[PDB]
Amino acid sequence: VTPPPEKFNFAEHLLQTNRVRPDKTAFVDDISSLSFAQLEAQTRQLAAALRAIGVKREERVLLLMLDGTDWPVAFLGAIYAGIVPVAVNTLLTADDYAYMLEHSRAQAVLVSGALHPVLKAALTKSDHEVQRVIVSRPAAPLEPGEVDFAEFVGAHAPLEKPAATQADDPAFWLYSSGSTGRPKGVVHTHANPYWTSELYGRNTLHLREDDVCFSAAKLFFAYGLGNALTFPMTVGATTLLMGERPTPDAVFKRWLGGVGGVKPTVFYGAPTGYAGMLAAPNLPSRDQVALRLASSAGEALPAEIGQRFQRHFGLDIVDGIGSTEMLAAFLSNLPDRVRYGTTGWPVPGYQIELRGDGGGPVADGEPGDLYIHGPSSATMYWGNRAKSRDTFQGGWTKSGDKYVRNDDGSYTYAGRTDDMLKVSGIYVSPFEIEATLVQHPGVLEAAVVGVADEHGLTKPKAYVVPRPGQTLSETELKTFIKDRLAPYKYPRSTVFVAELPKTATGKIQRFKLREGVL
Amino acid sequence: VTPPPEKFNFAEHLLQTNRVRPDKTAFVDDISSLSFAQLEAQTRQLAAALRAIGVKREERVLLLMLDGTDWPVAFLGAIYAGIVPVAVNTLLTADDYAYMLEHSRAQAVLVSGALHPVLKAALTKSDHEVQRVIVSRPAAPLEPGEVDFAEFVGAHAPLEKPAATQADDPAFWLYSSGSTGRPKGVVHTHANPYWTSELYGRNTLHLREDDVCFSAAKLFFAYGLGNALTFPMTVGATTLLMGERPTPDAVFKRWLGGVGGVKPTVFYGAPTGYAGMLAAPNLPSRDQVALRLASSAGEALPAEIGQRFQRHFGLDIVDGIGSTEMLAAFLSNLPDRVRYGTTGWPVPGYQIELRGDGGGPVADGEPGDLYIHGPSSATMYWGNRAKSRDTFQGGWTKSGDKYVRNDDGSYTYAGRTDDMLKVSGIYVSPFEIEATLVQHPGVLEAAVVGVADEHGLTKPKAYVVPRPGQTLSETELKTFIKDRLAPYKYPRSTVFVAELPKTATGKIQRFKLREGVL
């Protein structure tokens, strides 16, 4: 792959790529569609609209939007103007967004109507710098200083030229959370999604123009941003977008061609979703679907899930591991080379190292800390030099995973170095769940560990010491955490215990709980 | 009142004041008591202990503690060492404390056991700098880095001398919320509580050594910090402290001498609490109590409440108004000169100015914005230069209240300039409540305004537009807000309306919601 030119605007790059196909559908959702021509027009009008309200090159805007045809307009329109969109999870709390508004110094917000109430709460409580709120598909009356997204776009003539950015300039941020502390602002450059889209989307998955791409992973996830925006636009594929939660039935409806007149040929999701679909009584037969490629990321794919999918559909699931920091997969199985129980082989263009307790080589078959040297690495965590130093060191990026290299050069996941769990393919901190549990008045102590379920998928498990003299049932605890935590964070079971194993010092010996001591 | 010397440590000042009375009870609560000599010992030992764990002069520590004998030890111990305690409301959420930890850069936390769960959650989610957590009255096992308050104090010999602070050096912070944005870190000097305790506690209230002081307002409130710490210690009075919620029954128990063998002679509370007590069927008769003085702050005192108190007890309620920024009352009725329906007269030592829309004078009987020139003003909002400039206007402090001056020189509250609500004597932003309500899926729009109850006391009232096609009941909304707002933020009622009154641009006509148009 040839490097991008040093003068490079990623949005203009994707627009230019598709000037050969102006009338092909770029994006389609339940209620709307954009050809590549329409996408370019709306992208450049939104770029002008943001400039017209005073947002300047290198300033940030918060992009808080459900998947839908407005999402790539917002993302690419900001980037075309040299404005940095901060693309964020749509399932967070008002306090999370308040932090992100202050930390990013966002100058405007592009928000789905369904998400306006949580954004409103975030605005009210924070010391933010938001000059304008642009609401895509409002679900309630607008306030002054608020404008409808379609009117905002339609009220401004398209920007005549993109900002004269360099390839290594920041282009967008994503946020990623560790086991403690605030979400970290992961800074990606214009070059980084070129590298992922060429090295992985094109050269590994072999996506092509006649594909129809559909990702259960939403666009704010690094994984979904490639799957359903940067990869398909790089090759001219058509992309199906879906705002609603990706239940098996919602996914099947689209596989069967229920939206946009198109049947997806490429699907992407997490192993948990593949397990849920395989368990579904109305799982489609392979003659009903047009899938030619099934991608997975976000947690290790249990071998039996892949084998069951392959037996049913005659298609493998192609498991690869990326991260927010590396943007897309750096280890992956191939469409025609799949070893279940492993994450496959290094993606060409990426160098992989396993390092031991002194930073040196580990022997084959032995676990080591995974480090990645590749051209798509984020540059830093914005405003956090200490965590940046720990992670981005001289061309290498520390993943926080442990891996084992097998004799065929494949890599087998061996756990984390930082207590984080990957549940439904999404990062969950056990410490957050514990801190929620101990706020119930009947809970004295709580410890949360990851346990593999009947399909080998890790779910949280809570061990709770009740306060003596209080009655506390499993159902009341379930009720307590229902609206306090997002559903993927729910402990799969709770065990009430009389005490927790602690060192002579008071630290919970969580390994004894994973070993089943209680 | 003689100014404090330029070299001045407020904690040393209060300790030195009471060396004449070492064996008199300084503080007593339900389970413990401290004489003035015991208080001095523990104060100076805690000061040494904080220095030993590496907290330096001018660094902050978070003081998150229920009222009890350990509270003045924590507050005065920090100040004696030159460490700045940040004394905070005990009813807030983990999100609230996470921000306070980050903004104050607190280096340690002194926390009541009952508040350890919410602190634990705040520590886990925040980018804090907390090195050690000191737990007063632990209610669960300690974690590493955590130490019992009594053990911590007991492990260190008393510091020999106070830090060599200046009268105008920062001594402590309180946090003050506005109608939007983050709570503001109000910075008070060593001199400031000297001035309030001399000008108001001694020279206006005439507190004296044989008083027993008891405040329904907790110690983290500027009002309570004077009532039940700086004022009584200035004159050698004994203070009764109570950790639990100040219900009528809990207050009455203490009035009648149920704790510490002492009957309070001076009571302080909010008009809402006085109204609740006067309605109670078990209101004590005046021969049963030792009250000689009844102080009120936090919201305007309806004349019917004061008249009813006076008819029953033969005591007036002495209403004054202070602020977090001015630390104690700058307008007040006097013990023997009360005009109900007003906040009385300027406290000698404070200059009062009412200013109109152009900053000039206003005629008697006309409302103006209230400004205070007095020696107890905070110096700044830490880290917020813009709001500091709008508020601390060269020697004058803007209150954000409107007031009318009457012909006899008294002052009558005329409303806020900033839509804040004073409910149960406590600041509540209606915009915060509104933003919580609209996050219910059945709520389309909401507006919260202040409406008088049957005692003439302002409570929040919610006007809610339900979402069409959803079933939403007052009962369901009541259950929703139960656990996401503190009880004093509960709307007294909720009216469901088809539509809210708005201007041509969509802005809610909140005055007509108070004017009753719906």
Author numbering:
A (entry chain A), B (entry chain B): 6 to 523
The authors write:
BadA catalyzes the conversion of benzoate to benzoyl-CoA in the metabolism of aromatic carboxylic acids. Its catalytic mechanism is shown as follows: benzoate firstly docks to the active site, where it orientates to allow the carboxylic group access to adenosine triphosphate (ATP) for the formation of an adenosine monophosphate (AMP) intermediate; coenzyme A (CoA) subsequently comes in to substitute the AMP-activated intermediate resulting in the formation of benzoyl-CoA. The solved structures show that the benzoate binding cavity is rather small and narrow, constituted by several bulky amino acid residues including Y228, G327, S328, T329, H333, and I334. With the purpose to allow acceptance of various bulkier substrates into the active site, a double mutant H333A and I334A was created.
